[PDB]
């Protein structure tokens, strides 16, 4: 039977980028043609594989990661990027094999009073490894004196709100992103096009 890509693309609610969702897809026939010609996408970039070649390829597992970010930050979802999102929220490896798909979600994810449910990690001591997920809310220590879980000077909550408002310029508008990874192990493949 078919692979459940619509459960990812057509999801009503999306995860904050710091707590990005990942769907593991296995033991199914993937129909990439209908998937890529459904909605209209503002960003479609594939690395190490062509979108039309996927129907011919088989993979052990296919991962579909999804999250929401700002329009100005979509450029950071690509191999070899740096920035607050790539360093502290969602990082792709330098030899990434897959596709990055994004579309404007201003109608779904912005509110008249501002949507503060979507967050990103602002402070982190070190950069994330590729495909690493950090959901901690530990008070960030920016000085010599420890915080002991109490906010204060040099003691910052690690997450920051986006506050999406439908009239913002597109750089500040929310975008839903889906990243398709293609893991090729020396195991019997379960997902073919």
């Amino acid at each position: 039977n078919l692979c459940p890509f619509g459960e990812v693309f057509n999801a009503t609610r999306f995860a904050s980028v710091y707590a990005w969702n990942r769907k593991r897809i296995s033991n199914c026939v993937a129909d990439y043609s209908v998937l890529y010609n459904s909605a209209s996408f503002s960003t479609f970039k594939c690395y190490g594989v062509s979108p039309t070649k996927l129907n011919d390829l088989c993979f052990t597992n296919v991962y579909a990661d999804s999250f929401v970010i700002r329009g100005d930050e979509v450029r950071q979802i690509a191999p070899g990027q740096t920035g607050n999102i790539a360093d502290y929220n969602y990082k792709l490896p330098d030899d990434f094999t897959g596709c990055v798909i994004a579309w404007n979600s201003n109608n779904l994810d912005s509110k008249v009073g501002g949507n503060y449910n979507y967050l990103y990690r602002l402070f982190r001591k070190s950069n994330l490894k590729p495909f690493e997920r950090d959901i901690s809310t530990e008070i960030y220590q920016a000085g010599s004196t420890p915080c002991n879980g109490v906010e204060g000077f040099n003691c910052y909550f690690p997450l920051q709100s986006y506050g999406f408002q439908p009239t913002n310029g597109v750089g500040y508008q929310p975008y839903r992103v889906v990243v398709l990874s293609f893991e090729l192990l020396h195991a019997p493949a379960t997902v073919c096009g």
Epitope: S33, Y36, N37, F44, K45, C46, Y47, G48, V49, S50, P51, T52, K53, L57, P79, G80, D94, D95
Partner: antibody
Framework: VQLVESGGGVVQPGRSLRLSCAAS????????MHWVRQAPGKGLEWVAV????????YYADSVKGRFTISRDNSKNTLYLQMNSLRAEDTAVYYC??????????????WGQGTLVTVSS | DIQMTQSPSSLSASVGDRVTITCRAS??????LNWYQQKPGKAPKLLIY???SLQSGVPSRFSGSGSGTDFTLTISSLQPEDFATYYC??????????FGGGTKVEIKR
Amino acid sequence: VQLVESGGGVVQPGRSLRLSCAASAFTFSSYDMHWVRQAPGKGLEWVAVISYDGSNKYYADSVKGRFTISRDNSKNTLYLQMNSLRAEDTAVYYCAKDGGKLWVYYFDYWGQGTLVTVSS
Amino acid sequence: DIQMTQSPSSLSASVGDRVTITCRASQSISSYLNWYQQKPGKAPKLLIYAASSLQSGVPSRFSGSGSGTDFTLTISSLQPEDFATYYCQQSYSTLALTFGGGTKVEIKR
């Protein structure tokens, strides 16, 4: 493997023009097709790509939402609808058959090319 | 976008000489690097695909190598018909294919 282009000529800024490219001597309905242009004296710039069945289309950012690629597998012809032409679109447009021996795109055969000049 | 930097922009070599062209990528493109020959007034032709794989019908005197960010095309014995422009073209970013600036090979009189 032969690829023959036609439809090029002179066009005013903001007008439209349609290019064609007929394939021969290979299974045209199973390969992806590309468009690549080259401005006078400049280098090569990939323009667009279309799937074997014509359902999937992808364009470069310099022409997205302005050009349209299509194909007729029963006639073995590749098309490129060019609307809202700007002076920077002045180039020689080639059609390229996709190689197919890799996971990624590459051009193994090219067409001879036709000149498009955008000028009032 | 991934920029391909070729060096040199031009070179002068006589027939039989060994010519090497350098192609650098602004980021790692693995091995998805293709070479093309284009004669003035004619269509480009494929020479090397996937950094090192020779295309059917291309003479053996052409060879490619490299990985990551540094790639090289080599003509072991230059021939009179081998005087054209040589572009490298990365295919790691499949929906954003980019070409290098090119290297024109001309006669050293």
